[PDB]
Design a protein around this ligand. Structure first.
Ligand SMILES: COc1cccc2c(C(=O)N[C@H]3CCN(c4ccc(C)cc4)C3)c[nH]c12
Length: 85
């Protein structure tokens, strides 16, 4: 359903994704895998993600966010996913 722009594509590939065409659910899956395997979540308060000094933070223009309100990821996906025909 979607194709990611370069910085997002790099993140998904770092999480084990192949190619450049994905479903939205796949993108969400690989973003979660990325955060887990790169240990970006806060170690004591896992709802928080420290993305500063990572490509994800560069892409979001944030040092941190929380799943208490994951709106920054929504904005990023709107800007970085091309809808496929
Ligand atoms: C141990 O702790 C964690 C492990 C893995 C992942 C996480 C995590 C987090 O932000 N997952 C993201 C993954 C994609 N996603 C998302 C949310 C909203 C939209 C619109 C799109 C995608 C939420 C926070 N703690 C984690």
């Amino acid at each position: 359903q979607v194709r990611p722009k370069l910085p997002l594509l790099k993140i998904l590939h770092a999480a084990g994704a192949q190619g450049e065409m994905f479903t939205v659910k796949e993108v969400m899956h690989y973003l979660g895998q990325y955060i887990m395997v790169k240990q970006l979540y806060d170690q004591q308060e896992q709802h928080m993600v420290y993305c500063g000094g990572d490509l994800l933070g560069e892409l979001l223009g944030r040092q941190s966010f929380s799943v208490k309100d994951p709106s920054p990821l929504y904005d990023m996906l709107r800007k970085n996913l091309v809808t496929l025909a």
